[PDB]
Amino acid sequence: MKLKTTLFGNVYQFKDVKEVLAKANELRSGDVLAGVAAASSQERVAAKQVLSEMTVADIRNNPVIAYEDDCVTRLIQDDVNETAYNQIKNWSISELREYVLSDETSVDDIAFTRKGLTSEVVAAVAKICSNADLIYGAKKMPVIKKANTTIGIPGTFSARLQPNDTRDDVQSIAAQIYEGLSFGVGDAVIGVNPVTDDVENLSRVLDTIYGVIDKFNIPTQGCVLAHVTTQIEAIRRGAPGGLIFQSICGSEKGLKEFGVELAMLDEARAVGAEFNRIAGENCLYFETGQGSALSAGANFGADQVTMEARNYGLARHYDPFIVNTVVGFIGPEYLYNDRQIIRAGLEDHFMGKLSGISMGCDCCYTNHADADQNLNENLMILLATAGCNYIMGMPLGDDIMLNYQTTAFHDTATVRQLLNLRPSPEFERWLESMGIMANGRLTKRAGDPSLFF
Amino acid sequence: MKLKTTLFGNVYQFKDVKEVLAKANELRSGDVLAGVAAASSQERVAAKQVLSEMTVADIRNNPVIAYEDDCVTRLIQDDVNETAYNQIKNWSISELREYVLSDETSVDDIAFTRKGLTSEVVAAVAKICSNADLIYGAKKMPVIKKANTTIGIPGTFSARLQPNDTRDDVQSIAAQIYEGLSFGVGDAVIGVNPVTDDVENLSRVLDTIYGVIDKFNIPTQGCVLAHVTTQIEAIRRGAPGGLIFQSICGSEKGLKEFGVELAMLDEARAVGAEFNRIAGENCLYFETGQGSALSAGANFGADQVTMEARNYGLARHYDPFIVNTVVGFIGPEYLYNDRQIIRAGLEDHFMGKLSGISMGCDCCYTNHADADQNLNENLMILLATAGCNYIMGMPLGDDIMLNYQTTAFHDTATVRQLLNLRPSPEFERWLESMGIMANGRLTKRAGDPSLFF
Amino acid sequence: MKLKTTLFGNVYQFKDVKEVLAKANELRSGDVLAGVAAASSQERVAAKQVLSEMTVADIRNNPVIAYEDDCVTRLIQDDVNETAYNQIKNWSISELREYVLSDETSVDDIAFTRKGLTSEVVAAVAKICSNADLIYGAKKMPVIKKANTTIGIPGTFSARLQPNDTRDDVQSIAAQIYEGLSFGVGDAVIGVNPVTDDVENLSRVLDTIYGVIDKFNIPTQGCVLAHVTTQIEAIRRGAPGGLIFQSICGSEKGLKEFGVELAMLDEARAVGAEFNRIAGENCLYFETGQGSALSAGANFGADQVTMEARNYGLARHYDPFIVNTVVGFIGPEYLYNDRQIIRAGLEDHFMGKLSGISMGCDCCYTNHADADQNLNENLMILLATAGCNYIMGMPLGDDIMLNYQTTAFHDTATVRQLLNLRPSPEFERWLESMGIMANGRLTKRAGDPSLFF
Amino acid sequence: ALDLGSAEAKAWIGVENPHRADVLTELRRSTVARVCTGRAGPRPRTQALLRFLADHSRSKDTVLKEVPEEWVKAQGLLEVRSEISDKNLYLTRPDMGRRLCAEAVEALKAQCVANPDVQVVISDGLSTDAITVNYEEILPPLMAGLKQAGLKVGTPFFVRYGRVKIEDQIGEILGAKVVILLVGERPGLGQSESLSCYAVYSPRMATTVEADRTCISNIHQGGTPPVEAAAVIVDLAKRMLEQKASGINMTR
Ligand code: B12
Ligand SMILES: [N+]
Ligand SMILES: [N+]
Ligand SMILES: [N+]
């Protein structure tokens, strides 16, 4: 295989695939912090060309972390459909990119092709894609899942109600819930990030969430985004189960950083089948984001885009209901400004859709990064046109606990009426009977949380 | 619970739940052969009334075979969603039947309720259901699965192409393939019942099926209905795998009669994920039928309807692409005439749809039974109105090898054009491209196998 | 009116309306170069709050240039419907922003309200609007015009074919024409920016454009973007006239920099009515862009957003077929990076749609600015969701003459197929007749310029 | 007239024609979240957006403000810093913020109590205001309870430009049984005084993972009271010493 090319008469030679995957990335502060970024725009373009000329077999046979050394690599390699792989193993990444972008390629064609891929090959395609390539490519790759609502249908747009409080106070959490429901937010999940991690806290938050669900017969699901072990524990002891959440990393050492074993995710799948109040077949929830492996010292010289794609290969194994990247949650040391956060959000969603998971995105930023709320509104609309399955929702996007800014409840209603998108069909039926929505638009009395009183 | 009722001033005593389930059955020759049928029509109605008053917990806690003594009972009991069970454990079988038939009960309502049921409870509801109850109840309970074709969508009707031969002759098998495709048959599966059970014979038939599939780019899947062990070995050796088939029974002793372990079904699921040419996530295929448990001495004093319902709780664990009862495949010792075969067909399909599996039906009969071809035409139409996922297809319904008569290729086209039903959407697009079907109807050149030459 | 506000206990004093309008702008390099930007983010929010509390009369009565000293100010002030002004003269800028964004505000409501506005009031609303506000507000404000094609209909998306050459070579210009038509580009206009400003060169390019138009009976219009004086003289001499173009500025001193009198625009309107091959009643074409007034020293202490808004109040007087800002055409001295160019693009389009003109946008950037091609793809999609009337089109977006990068021919087809938007209905009918487009999508033979031979 | 930073602007209700305005004031009193601000179509109202931008301007300022050198000396604390030299590098080099500088390790072994059982470490992190506002309210009651009916309490010291993983090096250097790090969390929009606590039992730079720490976050007046947090941190260190485990390795 070729690891070198000549650009403008100058020869650009690279050491291995891991360097080609990293230097083909668009410029971001995380690849510079890892020392794997390209030195100039010429070497970045040269790395893209070498990457585009490598075959699917070249990248599949060279995982950034060895098989025998990483359980995430094993899971990705073991889950490959070898018949689908042998069909495409000799395709160059340039040909695979044009295959995904082709209008002659149907959704059913990609359904079998993506099974012959690994996360390293998925990341390789995103690296040689433009921003419009990432949006149009992901739009023609919808992924539909079902819990108590159906998510991912083209023409629909869901949103997670995120009611976080500085003390996990059930009065503050309920207040944000009635505000989000009045805007049509909550068909993805009503997920609470807990300021604590004790079992009696989770059950108290879950009892508050489901008290509202059972009161108005809301077709949705609840979740408290604590560690998966204490989620399993609370549900095993009587707490109402809906979605089971766990943060994931693209490497085994990254999972050990979060205290997560793969057996814990198998147990979450078994606890949900025995306990959870889910009509559909999908009840798991994962969240990702570039820079997690680098933060845990568990990237092994790989770039944060390749490591993020390994999240999607790991999540695909458990067929979750929803996955969303938290694109700008950490800080500028991994994604500095508006340009890098938008690019990462488009890459992450495209790679998640190419991996076959219900990919959403937390269009967000932090106050120590070079960004503002206009970035969240820029990316939320770009990803919506890309068919993003869902975004987050908070009052004005101000998280009083996580100390960051995400999208507002106004933002989901804006995207839905701007692009003529509907909620989940089960959730839309409830908003109509509640007098909150008509023809996908908010009624006059909508946006008023005192309507529920 | 009450094991007794007073009918017309006469007290009817019943031993256990097993006797009530058996005697509440409509009259069939298999229950008489099993010594479990009701002595009179009065006792049969008495067993129905006692059954209607027993709760869900009464029948969930009383399986016809013990948990510690049967792996199928363990699989059915362990798969129960216990939260959904506690919501309905106090409901009587009478209230559960009215709950299923209710127009105020949605598909998503049953989607969660059915998870709290066991196979013995599924049979209990069918025993107190009339023929129209079994039809209307199964219609409002659609089960949609997807391989290379989507099956079970309301308004659609699929069909299995069944090209059998007395010597597994591929030229005779291929002749029946072009015959079925010219009628629109084959969107469920092109499955061959093999004369021989050797690996090379299985691979030769598979190469013939997929040679036709690959030449015309047919969206469907191939299968050879041999034992699951030789199917797996042939696929491991390089034969093209589509659907992996295995006949199932509702008891561990019954599975031993066929030579099947539950680990064999786990392996077929793992082999299909690694080898099979399937775009969707469902790739397994099971066939059932009343009388198989009694034929193996593996019913343990239970009736053939309760034992058949246990096939579905077992099959649901593996989430297969298609299941179908072979309603009158064995002989009159289990189902005697037209009335018993029609009743069992409506029973099996309703119980399968209630259990959440993609339920079809081989509307068929044997030549030593009290039936003819007009029976198959009566049952196929009643089941099509019930939303039957698929039926079989042979030239005029005559199986030159299995020595029985199923439905014809003409029968699927008749059902579709009579009830305004379409094929699988992927397959319908292919028939339109082949000039065989336009607006769901056969064209002038349809029904002509020489069109493929 | 109040020129002062207290923010966090700190009193912020502002000189006049001109300083409040300038400092309320989002951070851009042109305002820093103009010495009118806010000193801190605190003062910027202070200028926004003071601006929100000022009434419509406060800003209508305080134009950045005096009436008696500027013919553009006279044109903007004389065109005001005084009855509509008296209805809204007491409304604050905060109430006007909420009035525009309101779902209870219809297109016919804004149709009359906008007549009582001036360009300085149009800029005031945009300054206190977020990026999503500029997008959703401009979407609900469609402006429909018609030449030989109808533009601006919601659900449609047009594109200008821009075939430029380093020597005005007609064979090189014609090559880019067949390239754009093969992608569906050209329903807005086939406009050539000329290297030379002589009459015979202009006529030669016009004969080439209309030779292609007449050969294939294309419903569209040709244009050569030279000075309006030499366009008029060439058309008077017999050259085929379609759209008559002229670059405009928001001040009389700015128009003098370009050598344009307001009588020249009256003449182009009179010449078009006598000579031009236009079926509709709109035949004029203007291009704008922030920084032109500051480049000519003709902003008079005003910011580039208020000066750009004055281009629209001037253009509205002549009711042209199309107007578009060339958002990043000049350089980084006026718009530095991706964030400022995206913001200005949303600003210019919202202000143009609020002023009642058929507002497009040349999503573009220069090579000495802090931008790349992924920026153009971000802005074209955000603006398409905002109902942008049209964008530009060149092969891969590379202008071999203007030395900048705009959107590609691929970009219009991507937007249309991504957002389910159609071309101009007259032009779409022609693309369908040419076998280039079917159901709003490019056919297999589309994108091939050799199709016209 | 209205100050966007005033309490009157923070308690503003923007719902135009409400179903129950009295209920709306009940939700507004129930949370710090920016609820009940109304809407202009599907977009936020003008005043609610203006207060958002005013809060972002204040939040962006607190990112680069350091705790003064005189304040850390006014608390009698030994100031020390990581490999980071300024806050601009601190935002881009988290690795350098997780290692003590060469002069840092030597200063620790020279002036701190050796082999303690509970070692308290106070650091700025990403919020200076979380240190200066909450310190005198939480530190006296914390270091009392650790001593009243207590044990061998180490010497406090301030780590400038520090990250959380630097407490693994501190526990290794000083041989501390339990290391308590009080650190300012990243700044929010409405407030920037959020203090966090990260505690680990006998850390090792080579084997300690992040899940080995116990986290108590949102320590401020709007969240967990610093006085209330002092009692639960002392109780925590007691259980980590009894169980000899921290993070997810503890019972219940
Ligand atoms: C950013 C963040 C993360 C980041 C950390 C990466 C990074 N470089 O910052 C990521 C996304 C990985 C993350 C993951 C998790 N987080 Co977190 N995290 C935060 C957040 C918003 C900021 C913390 C902060 O400002 N630290 C100060 C800076 C200066 O220190 P730092 O060295 O830069 O950051 C380190 C710590 O923050 C630490 N960390 C981050 N989160 C958590 C959670 C726990 C339990 C622990 C022990 C440590 C830890 O990891 C970083 C590297 O050392 C807080 C919210 C808050 N307002 O405090 C939640 C928070 C601390 N996280 C929390 C949770 C629940 C988790 C998870 C356990 C979620 C899950 N179900 O798996 C995971 C696992 C953490 C682990 N064991 O490694 C909870 C803690 C609940 C509790 N009382 O135990 C908090 C309070 C809020 C929340 N719900 O997200 N988190
Ligand atoms: N990641
Ligand atoms: N059976
Ligand atoms: N301008």
Coordinates of N, CA and C in Angstrom, one line a residue, chain B residues 18-73:
Chain B
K18 N -54.0 -27.1 33.1 CA -53.7 -27.9 31.9 C -55.0 -28.5 31.3
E19 N -55.9 -29.0 32.1 CA -57.1 -29.6 31.6 C -58.1 -28.5 31.1
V20 N -58.1 -27.4 31.8 CA -59.0 -26.3 31.4 C -58.6 -25.8 30.0
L21 N -57.2 -25.6 29.8 CA -56.7 -25.1 28.6 C -57.1 -26.1 27.4
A22 N -56.9 -27.4 27.7 CA -57.1 -28.4 26.7 C -58.6 -28.5 26.3
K23 N -59.5 -28.6 27.3 CA -60.9 -28.8 27.1 C -61.6 -27.6 26.6
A24 N -61.1 -26.4 26.8 CA -61.6 -25.2 26.2 C -61.4 -25.1 24.7
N25 N -60.5 -25.9 24.2 CA -60.2 -25.9 22.8 C -61.5 -26.3 22.0
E26 N -61.6 -25.8 20.8 CA -62.6 -26.3 19.8 C -62.2 -27.7 19.4
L27 N -63.3 -28.4 19.0 CA -63.1 -29.9 18.8 C -62.1 -30.1 17.6
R28 N -61.1 -30.9 17.9 CA -60.1 -31.3 16.9 C -59.6 -32.7 17.2
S29 N -59.2 -33.4 16.2 CA -58.9 -34.8 16.3 C -57.7 -35.0 17.2
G30 N -56.7 -34.1 17.2 CA -55.5 -34.2 17.9 C -55.8 -34.2 19.4
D31 N -56.7 -33.4 19.9 CA -57.0 -33.4 21.3 C -57.8 -34.7 21.7
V32 N -58.6 -35.2 20.8 CA -59.2 -36.5 21.1 C -58.1 -37.6 21.2
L33 N -57.2 -37.6 20.3 CA -56.1 -38.5 20.3 C -55.2 -38.3 21.5
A34 N -55.1 -37.1 22.0 CA -54.4 -36.8 23.2 C -55.1 -37.1 24.5
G35 N -56.4 -37.5 24.4 CA -57.2 -37.7 25.6 C -57.4 -36.5 26.5
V36 N -57.3 -35.3 26.0 CA -57.4 -34.1 26.7 C -58.6 -33.3 26.3
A37 N -59.4 -33.7 25.3 CA -60.5 -33.0 24.8 C -61.7 -33.0 25.8
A38 N -62.6 -32.1 25.6 CA -63.8 -32.1 26.4 C -64.7 -33.3 26.1
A39 N -65.4 -33.8 27.1 CA -66.3 -34.9 26.9 C -67.5 -34.6 26.2
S40 N -68.0 -33.3 26.3 CA -69.2 -32.9 25.7 C -69.1 -31.4 25.3
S41 N -70.0 -30.9 24.5 CA -70.0 -29.5 24.2 C -70.3 -28.7 25.5
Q42 N -71.0 -29.3 26.4 CA -71.3 -28.6 27.7 C -70.1 -28.4 28.5
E43 N -69.2 -29.4 28.6 CA -68.0 -29.2 29.3 C -67.0 -28.3 28.6
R44 N -67.0 -28.3 27.3 CA -66.2 -27.4 26.5 C -66.5 -25.9 26.8
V45 N -67.8 -25.6 26.9 CA -68.2 -24.3 27.3 C -67.9 -24.0 28.7
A46 N -68.0 -25.1 29.6 CA -67.6 -24.9 31.0 C -66.2 -24.6 31.1
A47 N -65.3 -25.3 30.4 CA -63.9 -25.0 30.4 C -63.6 -23.6 29.9
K48 N -64.4 -23.1 28.9 CA -64.2 -21.8 28.5 C -64.5 -20.8 29.5
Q49 N -65.6 -21.0 30.3 CA -66.0 -20.0 31.3 C -65.0 -20.0 32.5
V50 N -64.6 -21.2 32.9 CA -63.6 -21.3 34.0 C -62.3 -20.6 33.5
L51 N -61.9 -20.8 32.2 CA -60.7 -20.2 31.7 C -60.9 -18.7 31.6
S52 N -62.1 -18.2 31.3 CA -62.3 -16.7 31.2 C -62.2 -16.0 32.6
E53 N -62.5 -16.8 33.7 CA -62.4 -16.2 35.0 C -61.1 -16.2 35.6
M54 N -60.2 -17.1 35.2 CA -58.9 -17.2 35.7 C -58.1 -16.0 35.3
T55 N -57.2 -15.5 36.2 CA -56.4 -14.3 35.9 C -55.1 -14.7 35.1
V56 N -54.4 -13.6 34.7 CA -53.2 -13.8 33.9 C -52.1 -14.5 34.8
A57 N -52.1 -14.2 36.1 CA -51.2 -14.8 37.0 C -51.5 -16.3 37.2
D58 N -52.7 -16.7 37.1 CA -53.1 -18.1 37.3 C -52.5 -18.9 36.2
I59 N -52.4 -18.4 35.0 CA -51.9 -19.2 33.8 C -50.4 -18.9 33.6
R60 N -49.9 -17.7 34.0 CA -48.4 -17.5 33.9 C -47.7 -18.3 34.9
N61 N -48.3 -18.5 36.1 CA -47.7 -19.3 37.2 C -47.9 -20.8 37.0
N62 N -48.6 -21.3 36.0 CA -48.9 -22.7 35.7 C -48.7 -23.0 34.3
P63 N -47.4 -23.1 33.9 CA -47.1 -23.6 32.6 C -47.2 -25.1 32.5
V64 N -47.6 -25.5 31.3 CA -47.8 -27.0 31.1 C -46.6 -27.8 31.3
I65 N -45.4 -27.2 31.3 CA -44.2 -27.9 31.7 C -43.5 -27.0 32.8
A66 N -42.8 -27.7 33.7 CA -42.2 -27.0 34.8 C -41.0 -26.2 34.3
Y67 N -40.6 -25.1 35.0 CA -39.5 -24.3 34.6 C -38.2 -25.1 34.7
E68 N -38.0 -25.7 35.9 CA -36.7 -26.5 36.1 C -36.6 -27.7 35.2
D69 N -37.6 -28.0 34.4 CA -37.7 -29.3 33.7 C -37.7 -29.0 32.1
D70 N -37.7 -27.8 31.7 CA -37.8 -27.5 30.3 C -37.1 -26.2 30.0
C71 N -36.2 -26.2 29.0 CA -35.5 -25.0 28.6 C -36.4 -24.0 27.9
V72 N -37.4 -24.5 27.2 CA -38.3 -23.6 26.5 C -39.2 -22.8 27.5
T73 N -39.6 -23.5 28.6 CA -40.3 -22.8 29.6 C -39.4 -21.8 30.3

